[PDB]
Amino acid sequence: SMASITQLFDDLCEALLPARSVNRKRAKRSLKKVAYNALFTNLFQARNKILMLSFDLRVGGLGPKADRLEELVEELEAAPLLVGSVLDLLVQLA
Amino acid sequence: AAAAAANLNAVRETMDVLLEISRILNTGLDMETLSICVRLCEQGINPEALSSVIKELRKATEALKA
């Protein structure tokens, strides 16, 4: 049903693979190798954050967006369905 | 019944909105990739680790581009 997280990583590598082939194929293999080894190192040795970001756009001058953004994180959790972790990631990649 | 499909609309609409916030926060993720990461997350992938693995491969991508 849901895809093996192998194939998810495969899809993500391909999802940002740059441009048959050989250099393209040896690249993918190394893209995977950076992906897996990076997961593997990091794992061996919430909304607070996202409000503080909306604050910085406000101090960035970006009023309009800081308005929109806190509307969206209020509107997300005003719904009773399957995401603290995605935000965590999004706020991670800010 | 109707809630089986009404689920698919909520996750679509709601996938659209936090995509939009991903765009706001300037994460780099496009729709396709975003979804991948939603899946990974829901399987148990730690968000810290998952961002970190996104970071480093952007890095190598950029660098491998030369």
Swiss-Prot record, chain A:
It is found in: Cytoplasm, Cytoskeleton, Microtubule organizing center, Centrosome. It comes from the Eukaryota. Belongs to the TUBGCP family. Component of the gamma-tubulin ring complex (gTuRC) which mediates microtubule nucleation. The gTuRC regulates the minus-end nucleation of alpha-beta tubulin heterodimers that grow into microtubule protafilaments, a critical step in centrosome duplication and spindle formation. Component of the gamma-tubulin ring complex (gTuRC) consisting of TUBGCP2, TUBGCP3, TUBGCP4, TUBGCP5 and TUBGCP6 and gamma-tubulin TUBG1 or TUBG2. TUBGCP2, TUBGCP3, TUBGCP4, TUBGCP5 and TUBGCP6 assemble in a 5:5:2:1:1 stoichiometry; each is associated with a gamma-tubulin, thereby arranging 14 gamma-tubulins in a helical manner. Gamma-tubulin at the first position is blocked by TUBGCP3 at the last position, allowing 13 protafilaments to grow into a microtubule. It is linked to Microcephaly and chorioretinopathy, autosomal recessive, 1: A syndrome characterized by microcephaly, cognitive impairment, underdeveloped retina and choroid, and epilepsy in some patients. The more anterior parts of the retina, near the periphery and pars plana, have a grayish hue and diminutive vasculature similar to retinopathy of prematurity. Visual impairment becomes evident during the first year of life. This is Gamma-tubulin complex component 6. It comes from Homo sapiens. The chain holds residues 1 to 118 of 1819 of the full protein.
From Swiss-Prot, chain B:
It comes from the Eukaryota. Keywords: Acetylation, Cytoplasm, Cytoskeleton. The keyword Cell wall biogenesis/degradation does not apply. It is found in: Cytoplasm, Cytoskeleton, Microtubule organizing center, Centrosome; Cytoplasm, Cytoskeleton, Spindle. One of its GO terms (biological process) is microtubule nucleation by interphase microtubule organizing center. GO terms for cellular component: centrosome; cytosol; gamma-tubulin ring complex; interphase microtubule organizing center; spindle. The keyword Acetylation applies. Associates with the gamma-tubulin ring complex (gTuRC) consisting of TUBGCP2, TUBGCP3, TUBGCP4, TUBGCP5 and TUBGCP6 and gamma-tubulin TUBG1 or TUBG2; within the complex, interacts with TUBGCP3 and TUBGCP6 to form a luminal bridge with actin that stabilizes the initial structure during complex assembly. Interacts with TUBG1. Required for the recruitment and the assembly of the gamma-tubulin ring complex (gTuRC) at the centrosome. The gTuRC regulates the minus-end nucleation of alpha-beta tubulin heterodimers that grow into microtubule protafilaments, a critical step in centrosome duplication and spindle formation. Belongs to the MOZART1 family. This is Mitotic-spindle organizing protein 1. It comes from Homo sapiens. The gene is MZT1. The chain holds residues 11 to 76 of 82 of the full protein.
